[PDB]
Amino acid sequence: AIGDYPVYYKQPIRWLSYHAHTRPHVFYAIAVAALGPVFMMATPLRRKFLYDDHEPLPANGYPLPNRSRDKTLTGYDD
Amino acid sequence: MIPFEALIPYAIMFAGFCLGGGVMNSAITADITKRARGPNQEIKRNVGEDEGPRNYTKPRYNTDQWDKYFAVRDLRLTGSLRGQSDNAVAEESFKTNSIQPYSNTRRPWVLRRHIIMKNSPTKWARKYSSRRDEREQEIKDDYIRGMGE
Amino acid sequence: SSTHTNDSLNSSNYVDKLKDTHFVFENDKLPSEIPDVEEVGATTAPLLSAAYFIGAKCQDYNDDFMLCQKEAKGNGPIDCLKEGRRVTRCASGVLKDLNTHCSDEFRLHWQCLSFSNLEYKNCRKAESLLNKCVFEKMNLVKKIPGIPEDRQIHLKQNPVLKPVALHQDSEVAFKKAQNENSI
Amino acid sequence: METYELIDSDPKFSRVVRYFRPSDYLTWALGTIGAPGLMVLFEKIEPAKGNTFKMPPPSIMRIATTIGFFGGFYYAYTSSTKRFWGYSENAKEVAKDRYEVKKALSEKKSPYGSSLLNPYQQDMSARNSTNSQLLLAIFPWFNVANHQSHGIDLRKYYEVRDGEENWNFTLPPLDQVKDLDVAQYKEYSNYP
Amino acid sequence: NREKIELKREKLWARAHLMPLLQAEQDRNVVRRTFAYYKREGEIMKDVPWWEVKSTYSNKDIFHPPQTVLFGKHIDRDSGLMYANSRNRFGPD
Amino acid sequence: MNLEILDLSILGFYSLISSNSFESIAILVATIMPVITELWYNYSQLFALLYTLIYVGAVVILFVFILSVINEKEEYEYEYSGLFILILVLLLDDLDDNESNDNDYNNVYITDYADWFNNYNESDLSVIGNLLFTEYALLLLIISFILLMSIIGLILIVKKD
Amino acid sequence: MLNNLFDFIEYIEYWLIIVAFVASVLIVVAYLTVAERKTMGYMQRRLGPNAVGYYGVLMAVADALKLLSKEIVLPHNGDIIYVMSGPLISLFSVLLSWAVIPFGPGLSLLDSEYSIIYLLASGSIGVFGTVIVGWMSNSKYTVLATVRTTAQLISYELVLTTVVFIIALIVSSLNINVIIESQYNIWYIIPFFPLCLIFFISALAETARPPFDNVEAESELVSGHMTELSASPFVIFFLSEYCSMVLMSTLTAIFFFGGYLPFSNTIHHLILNLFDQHSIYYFIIEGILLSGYLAIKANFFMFSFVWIRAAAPRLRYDLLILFCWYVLLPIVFAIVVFAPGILYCFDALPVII
Amino acid sequence: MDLILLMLVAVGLNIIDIYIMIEILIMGCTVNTIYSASLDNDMIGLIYSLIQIIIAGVESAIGLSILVNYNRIRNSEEIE
Amino acid sequence: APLQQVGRHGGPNKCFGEFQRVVECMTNAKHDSYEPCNNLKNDYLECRKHKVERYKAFLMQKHAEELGKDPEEIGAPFVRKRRFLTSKTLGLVDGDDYEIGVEKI
Ligand SMILES: CCCCCCCCCCCCCCCCCC(=O)OC[C@H](COP(=O)(O)OCCN)OC(=O)CCCCCCCCCCCCCCCCC
C-alpha cells in the first residue's frame, strides 16, 4: 500500500493527507470555510476575556420615556 | 534604463482622469454654492462688497428619505434644494408654500399593452367582467345614500 | 434610500412624467381658532449642528410632544397642536441663542458640515470649539444616551475614521484656541 | 382526551434532551440499530439478488446506522416534547421543571435565560419554532434560543405545591428578576 | 466597524432630537391642508342641502387626512426655457 | 408624450411577424428591457436592477441552447400574413388599453404625507433581508431546498451516464 | 448679450460637465491602446508606435480615423441592423457602467444605494452584444466564437459577482462611494489579497483578455466574432472592449486600493494647504489630486493588463471552465462564510454611516 | 382583442417560443406584485416579488434541461 | 401572528394600523358575530385604494361642471415641472422666476 487510498475511519490523519496532496482545491476550500463557524463558537471566549458587546443601537423609533405625561409642564405658551 | 517614451501614453491617461476630476469637482461645487446665495439671479451672480469670503458646499452623496424631506424644506426656505440659512424664525411665506406631489396609481404600460404579458384569467376578469366593478360600486353608492339619515 | 414615493420629490423628471405628478400648492392658512406660531427657519446644516443642543434644552417638551402622540390613539396631528407649538418655540429659542452668543462658532460648524457631506466625523475640530462655547454661555452639554460618558465618539481622541480633506477655517480657529485658551 | 399540565409550549433544545427518560434513550438506541436490522430483515424476507441470503455490504450498514441514529433521536425528541406540551403524562417532568424555575427565580435570574436576541428577534424566533415538532418527521426545526414566549405564567411558580415546602426557596417579585419583560422597560417603553 | 456603530448611534440620536420639531411643523401642514380640503368641498357642495362634509372613514376617532385634491391653475403652463412665465398663485393673473 | 407606448407597439408588431427561433429570443430581450426601464423610473429601482441581474444571465443560456437545435426549418418556410391585416390587428388592440374599469381609481390622483418618525432610514433591500432571514426564514430555506433539487434534477436529465 | 449669456451657460452647464466626463474616459481608452503597444514593445525589446504623431501621441487618432474612413461590408445596405446591433449593445453597456464610478466624494453621475447592482447588471448586458454577431451567421469562425463567449461568461460571472458581494458584505452597503470611503484606515488589498487576485482573474476573463483570450484567438479563430466586421462596427467593438479594460482596472483600484483616497494623508494635506478654500482653485486642484490618486492606481492595473498579456500564454476555454468551478467558486464561497464569522466573533458587524 | 385569443398568434411556432411565452406571462405577475407593493409601501409584497423571480428561474432551468435531453436523443447515434 | 403591511424602513406603514384594528376586532371574544368589525374592514380597504374618496372627488368635479364653475377658480394651484418650482411661486420676498437647480443636489 505504497500509494493506496486511505480508509477514513481507520486512518483519519492519512486520509486527510491524501486530499491535501491530490485535491488541494477541496482540502483548503473547506479549511477556509470551516474557520467561519469556528470563530463564531469562540465568541463567548472574547465576551469574557477581551471586551463586551456594544449597547444596541436606537433603531426602534423615538425613545418614549416609560412614564405618564407631566401635567405640571408649562412654558413657551401661546 | 527607464524608457520615457513608453510612459508618455500613461501620462496622457493620467491627465485624462484629472480632466474629469478637475471639471467635476469644481464646476459642481461652484454651482451648488452659487445657488445657495439667494432666490434671485442678482444675488447668485453679483457679489456684495460687505459679503465675506465664499464658503463652498460640496456635493451630497449617500442620502436617504430624510435628506429628500430636507431638500424640499430647504427649497421652501431659500429657493434652493441645498440653500443655507440659520435664521431662528422662518418667513411668513414658508407657512403656505408647502409642496404636495399628486400622481396617478395606474399599472405600468407594459402590463396593459404587451401583446402577451397582459393576458391572464384575472386580468381578463378585471378588463372584461363587470362582476368586480358592479359590487364595488355599491360601496361608493352607499356613501351618498347615508348622508341624509 | 432613494425609493420613489408619492409623498416627496422623486429622483428625476422622468419619474414625474410617468406618474403625471402635480406639485400642488395650498393658499389657505390655518384657521384662526388655532394660535399662530413662528416656524423654524434653519436649513439642514444648522439643524444638524444644533441637534444635540435642541435636545438638551427642550428634552421635556420633546418628550411631552411625543408622549402626546402615543396617548392620542391615532388622533395625534389634531390633538397635539398645543404640544407641537411648545417644541417649535423652544427649538427657535436655542437657535436664537446660538446667533447671539456663539454665532462665530455656530456658523463655523454647520459650514464645515456643508463642506464635508454633513458628516459629524469630519468636523470634530469645529464641533469641539462650538461645544465648549455653548457650555460656557448656555450651560448645555452634548450627551449621547445609552453609553458611558467617556465612551462617546465625539470625545474620542484618536478616531479610526477621519476626514480626507481638512477644513481650513476649522484648522485656523482650532490653532487660535490651542495656544491662547490653553497657555 | 388525556390532558396533563402544560409545562412549556416551546421547550428549548437542551431542555428537551435533558428531560429524556430512560425509555427515551431506549427508543433512541432501538432506532439506531433498527435500521440496520430492517436491512437484514428485508434481505431475509426477500434477498436483493438471487434466492439465498446475502448480508448487505458494510458500507450499507454504516449509512443505515446513521439514518437510524437521526431517526431514533427524532422519535425520542418528539416523545419528550409531548411532556412539555402536556399531551403525555409528565408528573416527573413537572416536578423537575418547577424546581429549576424556582431556583432561577430565587437567584433573580430569568428561568428562560439571557438572550443575544433583541425583543423583536426573541418573539420572531418563538413564532418560527413553536409547534414545529408536529412537522419534525418532514424536516427539522428546534428552539435553540432563550425567548420568553413559552405559553405559561411565572405566577404559578409562586404557589407552593405538595412536596415543595422543604425546598426552602424565597421568590422575589418578577419585576426584580433580570432578563424579564416586566423588569426591562424601565427608562423607555420601546427599548428594554 | 465598531466606530461606525458609535457614529451610527450619534447620528440616530441627533435625528431623534430634531424629530419633535420637524414633525410638529409637518403636523401643522397636514392639518392646514386637511382644513383646506373640506373648505373646498363645502364651497362646491354648499348648494346641496343634504350633502354632509366628512371623511370617507367610519372610524371618527382616528384622524384620516384626505389624500385627494381638485386641480386648479397651472402655474408653469406658459413656462418656456430658462425662465418660468409663472401665472399668479393667489387669484387671477 | 408616453414613449413607452411606441416601444410596445414596435415590440408587438415584431411578435406577430417573428418566424425563426432567434427572433423569438430577441422578442424576450425586447420585453425585459421595457419592463426594466419602466421599473427603473416610477415604481421600483431595486427590482429594475434585479431583473437585469438575473434575466440577462438566463437569456445567454437560452441563446446558447438555440445554436444546438436550429435545423433549417424556418429559413425556408413561407409565411403569408399581409401588411394590411397586421396593422389592422395591432390598431384594434391599441383601442382598448384600460386594464381596469374603476374610472375613479384611474382618473383621480392621490398623495401621501411623509413623516419624520423613521429616523432610522435604510434601503428597501435591507428591510427585505431583515424579514426574509428572520420572519420568513422557512421560505428562504425551502427556496434553497428547491435550488438543491434543480441541481440534482439537471444532472439526471442531461448527463448520459 | 452678457446677461442673456451668463444664464445660458448656467442653463447648459451640466451638459458641458457630462461632455467633459465623456472626453475624460475616451482619452484614457484611446491612449490605452497606445500604452499597451508601447508597454509590450519594450518588454519584447521593440519600441512600439513612435512615428504617428510626435513620439506616437497621434497613434490612436490615426487608427480610429482610418477605420472610420473604411467601407462597411454587409450583404445589403439595409442590413445595417445586423452588423451594428451587436457592437452598439456592447458599447452602451460599458459606457453606462461608468455612470457610477466616482472620481471623488460624490463625484459620480449616478448616485444610489444600489450602485453595485447597477454595475454588475450593466456589465452583463454587454455579453448579449457579443452573441448577437453570431445571428445564424454563415461565417463558421464567427459561430465558434459565440460558443466560446457563452462558455467564458459561465466561468467568470459567478466568481466575479460573489467577490464583489463579499466587499459589499464587509461594508454592508451596495453603494460604490460608501465602499471607497470605508477604506480610509485599511485598504482591502491587505485583508482580501486572495480576492484581489480572483477579481483580476475574473476581470481578464470578462474582457476576454489573455491568458483568457479564447474569443478572439488569432491562432484559433482568426478574429473571432469580429472576423466579418469592418469600419465602424469594428471600431465600436474595439472601443467597447478597451473601455471595459479601463473600467475593470478602475474597479480594482476602487474595491481593494481605496479608490480615490490618497496614498499618504500627510502629503494630501500639505498640497491643499497651499491653496485657499475660498477660491475655486482649491477645488480644481482637489479634483486633480483625488482623480490623480485613482488614475495612478488604475494605470497600474491597466499596465498589469498589458503585463500579463506579454508574459503568459493563452489558456483553453474548457480548462477555464474547470478552473472557475472547481477552484475559484469553492474559495470565494468559503470566504463569504469566513468573513461574517470573523465580524460577528469580534462584535464588528458593519453598518452604514 | 384579448377574448379572441390574439396572444396565440404572437407566440412563435417553436418549442422554445412556448418557453419564452411562459417566462413573459410569469414576469407579468411579478410586475403586478411590484406595482401593488410599491403603492402600499409594503415590503411583504416585495418579498413575494423576489420569490417569484427566483422560482421562475428554477422553472426555466428544469424545462431547458428536458428540452436539451429531448434534442439529444434524436441526435444520439454518435457512431462517428 | 405574521407581520403584514411593513413599511420600507422596517416599521408599520400607513395602513398597518387599520389592519391591526381589524385583527383585534375579529379575534376579540366579546363579539358574537363579525358585524361590528365590518366598518373597520372598510377603513383598511379605503386606506390602500381610496376608492370612496376618489369617487367623492369625481362627484365634486362633475357637480362643478354643470354649475359652470371654472376648475382654476375653485381648484388648487399646481406646477408640473420640478425645475419651475421657482422662488416667485414659493412666495419668497426676493423670489425670482428663474428655474431652480434639480440636476445634482
Ligand atoms: C440596442 C441598440 C442596438 C440594436 C438596434 C437594433 C434595432 C433592431 C430592432 C431592435 C428590436 C426592436 C423590437 C423588435 C423585437 C425583435 C424582432 C427582431 O427580430 O429584430 C428586428 C430585426 C429587423 O429586421 P427584419 O428583417 O424586419 O425582421 C425579420 C423579418 N423576418 O430583425 C432581426 O432579426 C435583426 C436582429 C438584430 C439583432 C437584434 C437583437 C435584439 C436587440 C434588442 C436590443 C434593444 C432592446 C429592445 C428595444 C426596443 C423594444 C421594443
Residue E77 · residue E93 · CB < 8 Å:
no
Task: Return d(Cα F54, Cα B113) in angstroms, integer.
Answer: 24
How many residues belong to chain G?
Answer: 353
Task: Return d(Cα A16, Cα D103) in angstroms, integer.
Answer: 48
User: All 3 cell numbers of residue A30?
Assistant: 473547506
User: All 3 cell numbers of residue C44?
Assistant: 439642514
SS3 per residue for chain G: CCHHHHCHHHHHHHHHHHHHHHHHHHHHHHHHHHHHHHHHHHHCCCCCCCCCCHHHCCHHHHHHHHHHCCCCCCCCHHHHHHHHHHHHHHHHHHHHHHHHCCCCCCCCCCCCCCHHHHHHHHHHHHHHHHHHHCCCCCCHHHHHHHHHHHHHHHHHHHHHHHHHHHHHHHHCCCCHHHHHHCCCCCCCCCCCHHHHHHHHHHHHHHCCCCCCCCCCCHHHHCCHHHCCCCCHHHHHHHHHHHHHHHHHHHHHHHHHCCCCCCCCHHHHHHHHCCCCCCCHHHHHHHHHHHHHHHHHHHHHHHHHHHHHHCCCCCCCHHHHHHHHHHHHHHHHHHHHHHHHHHHHHCCCCCCCC
User: All 3 cell numbers of residue F134?
Assistant: 428572520
Cβ F7 under 6 angstroms from ligand 1: yes
Cis peptide bond N-terminal to A37, omega within 30: no
Deposited experimental method: cryo-EM
Q: Which residues of I touch B82 (CB under 8 A)?
A: 105
User: All 3 cell numbers of residue G219?
Assistant: 491562432
How many residues belong to chain I?
Answer: 105
Closest listed residue to residue B95, CA positions, set B80, B68, B70, B73: B73
Closest listed residue to residue C95, CA positions, set C108, C86, C85, C107: C107
Closest listed residue to residue C180, CA positions, set C142, C123, C132, C141: C132
Counting runs of H as helices and runs of E as strands, what totals does chain E give? 1, 1
Residue C123 · residue C116 · CB < 8 Å:
yes
Task: Return d(Cα G252, Cα G299) in angstroms, integer.
Answer: 11
Per-position b or e across C98-131, b if 16+ CB within 10 A of its CB:
bbeebeebbbbbbbbbbbbbbbbbbbbbbbbbbb
User: All 3 cell numbers of residue A3?
Assistant: 500509494
Cβ G22 under 6 angstroms from ligand 1: no
Task: Return d(Cα H30, Cα H24) in angstroms, integer.
Answer: 10
Residue H26 · residue H51 · CB < 8 Å:
no
Query: What phi and psi, each to the nearest 5 degrees, are found at residue I79?
Result: -125, 135
Residue C86 · residue C54 · CB < 8 Å:
no
Give the SS3 label for residue E24: helix
Residues 6 or more apart whose CB falls under 8 angstroms from that of H52 comprise H26, H29, H30, H33
User: Which residues of F lie closer than 8 Å to D, measured between beta carbons?
Assistant: 134-135, 137-138
Task: Return d(Cα H16, Cα H28) in angstroms, integer.
Answer: 19
CA geometry: angle C3, C8, C11, nearest 5 deg: 50
Residue H56 · residue F51 · CB < 8 Å:
no
Distance from the alpha carbon of residue F14 to the mean position of ligand 1, in angstroms: 8
Cβ G81 under 6 angstroms from ligand 1: yes
Helix G280-309 and helix B4-35, axial crossing angle in degrees, nearest 10: 140
> CB atoms < 10 A from the CB of G352, how many?
19
Q: Which residue has the cell 466624494?
A: G105
Residues 6 or more apart whose CB falls under 8 angstroms from that of E28 comprise C30, C37, C81, C84
How many residues belong to chain F?
Answer: 161
Residue A18 · residue A6 · CB < 8 Å:
yes
Per-position b or e across A1-36, b if 16+ CB within 10 A of its CB:
eeeeebeeeeeeeeeeebbeeeeebeebbeebbeeb
Question: Ligand 1 atom 39: the closest Cα is on which residue?
Answer: G85
Describe chain A by its helix, strand, coil percentages, rounded to 5.
45, 0, 55
In a 10 Å sphere around its CB, with 0-12 CB exposed, 13-18 middle and 19+ buried, how is residue C137 labelled?
A: middle
The amino acid sitting at A29 is A
Residue B112 · residue B118 · CB < 8 Å:
yes
DSSP labels, C5-25? -SSS--S-HHHHHHHT-EEE-
Closest listed residue to residue B28, CA positions, set B78, B67, B82: B82
User: All 3 cell numbers of residue G317?
Assistant: 476555454
Task: Return d(Cα I73, Cα I85) in angstroms, integer.
Answer: 21
User: All 3 cell numbers of residue B22?
Assistant: 478637475
Residue I37 per-residue DSSP state: G
Q: Which of F40, F56, F121, F125 to substitute to test the interface with G, most G CBs within 10 Å?
A: F56
Task: Return d(Cα G217, Cα G152) in angstroms, integer.
Answer: 13
The amino acid sitting at C16 is D
- Order across the sheet with C22-24: list the strands: B100-102, C22-24, I76-79, E71-74
CA geometry: angle I63, I67, I73, nearest 5 deg: 90
Task: Return d(Cα C113, Cα C115) in angstroms, integer.
Answer: 5
Distance from the alpha carbon of residue B46 to the mean position of ligand 1, in angstroms: 53
Task: Return d(Cα I6, Cα H40) in angstroms, integer.
Answer: 9
Cβ G26 under 6 angstroms from ligand 1: no
Contact between C80 and E27 using a beta-carbon 8 Å cutoff: yes
For a mutational test of ligand 1's pocket, the pick from G79, G83, G85, G95, i.e. the residue with the most ligand atoms closer than 8 A to its C-beta, is: G85
Contact between F111 and B103 using a beta-carbon 8 Å cutoff: yes
Task: Return d(Cα C65, Cα C55) in angstroms, integer.
Answer: 13
Residue C26 · residue I76 · CB < 8 Å:
yes
Q: Which residue has the cell 448656555?
A: C138
Residue G235 · residue G199 · CB < 8 Å:
no
The amino acid sitting at C79 is D
Question: Which atom belonging to ligand 1 lies closest to the Cα atom of F31?
Answer: 50
Q: How far is F102 from chain D (nearest CA, A)?
A: 39
Is residue I41 less than 8 Å (CB to CB) from chain E? no
Q: Which residues of I touch C24 (CB under 8 A)?
A: 76-78
Cβ F23 under 6 angstroms from ligand 1: yes
Contact between B65 and F114 using a beta-carbon 8 Å cutoff: yes
Cβ G199 under 6 angstroms from ligand 1: no
- For residue G88, give Cα distances in angstroms to G78, G233, G241: 17, 8, 12
User: All 3 cell numbers of residue G100?
Assistant: 457610477
Task: Return d(Cα F123, Cα F114) in angstroms, integer.
Answer: 16
Closest listed residue to residue E58, CA positions, set I59, I36, C79, I24: I36
Closest listed residue to residue A4, CA positions, set A13, A14, A12: A14
Q: Which of E25, E29, E69, E70 to substitute to test the interface with F, most F CBs within 10 Å?
A: E69
Q: Which residue has the cell 359652470?
A: I68
Question: Ligand 1 atom 9: the closest Cα is on which residue?
Answer: G81
> CB atoms < 10 A from the CB of F75, how many?
10
Task: Return d(Cα G108, Cα G18) in angstroms, integer.
Answer: 10
Give the SS3 label for residue D134: helix
Residues 6 or more apart whose CB falls under 8 angstroms from that of D148 comprise D110, D112, D122, D126, D180, D181
Residue C88 · residue E38 · CB < 8 Å:
no
Chains that touch E (3 or more CB pairs under 8 A): A, B, C, F, G, I
G199 Rama class: left (phi>0) / alpha (psi -120 to 50) / beta: alpha
Q: How far is G293 from chain F (nearest CA, A)?
A: 30
Resolution in A: 2.8
Q: Which residue has the cell 476649522?
A: C170
Query: What torsion do the CA atoms of F117, F120, F125, F127 make, to the nearest 10 degrees?
Result: -70
Q: Do chains F and B touch (3 or more CB pairs under 8 A)?
A: yes
Contact between G7 and E82 using a beta-carbon 8 Å cutoff: yes
Closest listed residue to residue B98, CA positions, set E76, C18, I77, I102: I77
Cβ G125 under 6 angstroms from ligand 1: no
Task: Return d(Cα C46, Cα F93) in angstroms, integer.
Answer: 57
- For residue B8, give Cα distances in angstroms to G24, G43, G219, I4: 17, 16, 31, 62
Q: Which helix or strand (DSSP H or E) is residue B86 part of?
A: strand B86-87
Residue B133 · residue F103 · CB < 8 Å:
no
Task: Return d(Cα E84, Cα G44) in angstroms, integer.
Answer: 64
